[PDB]
A paper describes a structure:
We report the capsid structure of the African cichlid nackednavirus (ACNDV), determined by cryo-EM at 3.7 Å resolution. The sequence identity with HBV is 24% and both the ACNDV capsid protein fold and the capsid architecture are very similar to those of the Hepadnaviridae and HBV in particular. The capsid is made up of 90 protein dimers to give T = 3 symmetry, with three molecules located within the asymmetric unit: chains A, B, and C. In both HBV and ACNDV, two Cp monomers associate into stable dimers via two central helices, the resulting four-helix bundles generate outward pointing spikes, and the N-termini up to the beginning of helix α3 are wrapped around the spike helices; helix α5 together with subsequent residues forms a hand-like region providing the essential inter-dimer contacts.
We used cryo-EM density maps of the pH 7.5 and 5.5 samples to build atomic-resolution structures of ACNDV capsids. At the N-terminus, the ACNDV Cp sequence starts with a small α-helix (α+), which points towards the capsid exterior surface. However, the very first residues are not visible in the cryo-EM density map. The α2-helix is wrapped around the spike helices of the partner molecule in the dimer and the spikes are made up of a four-helix bundle within the dimer helices α3 and α4 in each monomer. Comparison of the AB dimer, formed by the quasi-equivalent conformation of chains A and B, with the CC dimer, reveals that the four-helix bundles forming the spikes match well when superimposing AB with CC dimers, while the hand regions appear to be shifted. This rigid body like conformational shift between the quasi-equivalent capsid subunits observed in the cryo-EM structure agrees with the solid-state NMR measurements, which show few local conformational changes, as is further elucidated below. Secondary structure elements derived by NMR and obtained from the cryo-EM structure of ACNDV Cp at pH 7.5 agree well. Residues 66-74 were omitted in the structure because the cryo-EM map density was not well resolved at the tip of the spike for pH 7.5 and 5.5 capsids, yet the connection between the spike helices was visible in local resolution filtered maps. Unassigned cryo-EM map density located below the spikes of AB dimers but not below CC dimers was found in the ACNDV capsid maps. Likely sources of the diffuse density below AB dimers are enclosed nucleotides and/or the flexible CTD of the capsid protein.
Author numbering:
A (entry chain 1B), F (entry chain UB): 0, 2 to 65, 75 to 135
B (entry chain 1A), E (entry chain UA): 0, 2 to 65, 75 to 136
C (entry chain 1C), D (entry chain tC): 0, 2 to 65, 74 to 135
The structure:
């Protein structure tokens, strides 16, 4: 995964992916995909990326129907699901709000529990 | 493939992926990713998207190092390269030029081989 | 800390050391050093000193990762550096006045008996 | 020095490290720390960081004053700190531009063969 | 090759050297050097650089007139011609045009042979 | 080496290479290459020439690990080192200053020792 490491060291880079624990489960994340694609018109390039991304999860899920080999796919599904959910948040809240929101989550989850305070408020559907 | 099928059944859709017979090998495609990512400044959102797909492809290749599982994964890798390779040409030529170039190949490929003629050349690089 | 004693009498002096229990583990502290450096667009002399200070911790981690007195001595140096590094991160993220003002409230809040503490003080907003 | 690599590409960056042979022994370096602090009348944030940095050396001196790898490791940390402390002393006494400008002349002067070096470069005036 | 590797890992880098499979033979390349150098006026700094490389290549060829030594030198000569030949095209076509022409060959060469198509032509000569 | 002779007979040509004796030793000359390339940004065409030139010396140096054949490489290393050092001087002092400085060196080194006087002052880092 050296490719992402190079980007993470670049100038003006802000992470847009939530921690694995905070990411929803599969399937339920896919439900939001239909609520966006089916409810959208005037196709745009980003809509194809999500479709070409969501369908990969289904193929991996269908593969459930070597165990170390199988374990790799399960991690991949979570990785793709984490990436896929980021676009869903990017679509609802835009891009700027997600940048600030993700930054606060890290601080609240990094400081010791004795001084965290309260979980930061997620952004609004503006 | 239902999700991609829905997108194709839309208005304003423009396919940007070349036929599988023209995409380079996975190793070659990853080579261009490093050159583009390494020689870039002022990180842009699309750069992260390209990197994430490259990371996913690497994991599958490492996993290769159960026949339905093995055979199915190979198809995913080929699809991943096609999606990633088509995104590279957007950076080199441009999305507008890619549409015509992909469209030209389709008519050229669909035309009978007897009178097919010379293959059209790729567009000019983005300035 | 004889040098520190030479700074207490100075007019504009402040105690730039958060409680030892407040700071997280060294690994997490270094993680936020990259984010502040990566996010920053321009350059100031302070970040260069910050970058060098963090680098020393990694060598100490690698170096640490009859000898008990020295092995224990290395840990104390690493922890002390983390507090100083963690102080800069907090002050930059929130502000010098807010951190010092916040520290006094929480420091007194813990001292007050639990039967009358009430609620914990206001955590500074990221601004 | 991965963090340092993140600062080289920055526009306003300079190499703030004099040659190891140029700096004196640690004891002499700490001696001039008091003079700059004692002479100074007002307070700025930089001296507070300088005071803390010097204090760490004294603990290392006391701490240093199968164990060979760690004992040798402590010496390297002390020497590296002295260069950074010695750099600040020189820049403050003479100036940032003069020190960097002077370093290049002397660095090249030594490289030139003795048969054609001539005379040593100009030592910066105390101003 | 560390030094060249460092340059490739920079921003604004543009490779100007063709693949070794396309460079002419060393004798042919030296032929163009004489024509350019002989038919020139108002000596320019780049002219000296081209001449010096040509002189170095000649010495190696004369030296040919120990297998690791002999084999290693032949690789140097081929590299020398590639570096020298790439510099000739800068004078004929131009640096800007060379970048695209070299870039076009890379995509053309990387594209699968089945659908590779006609080889792109060189740019127009500098006026 | 007839190629350089043709250039040396051209109009408006000024030598920028110091005598062999005044040129530093190898390796130490290479140290300045790193201090320039590693400290440089916004790659420029000349930076590639130095890299493609310095690396040749390393290959020749590695060859140390037929003696008339070997002697040829040693002379080549000095020749390349002399050429490589000229670029280093050209980078620090520019081009105009080096032209004048090299000219004075020749006069001081050509006149008899009874009338040389003092070695000319090398230029400054302007």
């Amino acid at each position: 995964g050296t490719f992402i490491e190079l980007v993470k060291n670049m100038k003006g880079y802000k992470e847009l992916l939530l921690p694995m624990e905070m990411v929803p489960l599969p399937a339920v994340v896919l439900k939001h995909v239909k609520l966006i694609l089916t409810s959208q018109k005037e196709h745009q390039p980003w809509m194809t990326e999500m479709a070409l991304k969501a369908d990969q999860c289904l193929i991996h899920k269908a593969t459930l129907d070597a165990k170390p080999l199988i374990e790799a796919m399960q991690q991949i599904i979570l990785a793709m699901t984490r990436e896929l959910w980021g676009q869903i948040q990017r679509h609802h809240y835009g891009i700027v709000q997600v940048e600030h929101y993700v930054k606060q989550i890290t601080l609240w989850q990094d400081t010791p529990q004795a001084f965290r305070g309260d979980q930061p408020k997620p952004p609004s559907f503006r």
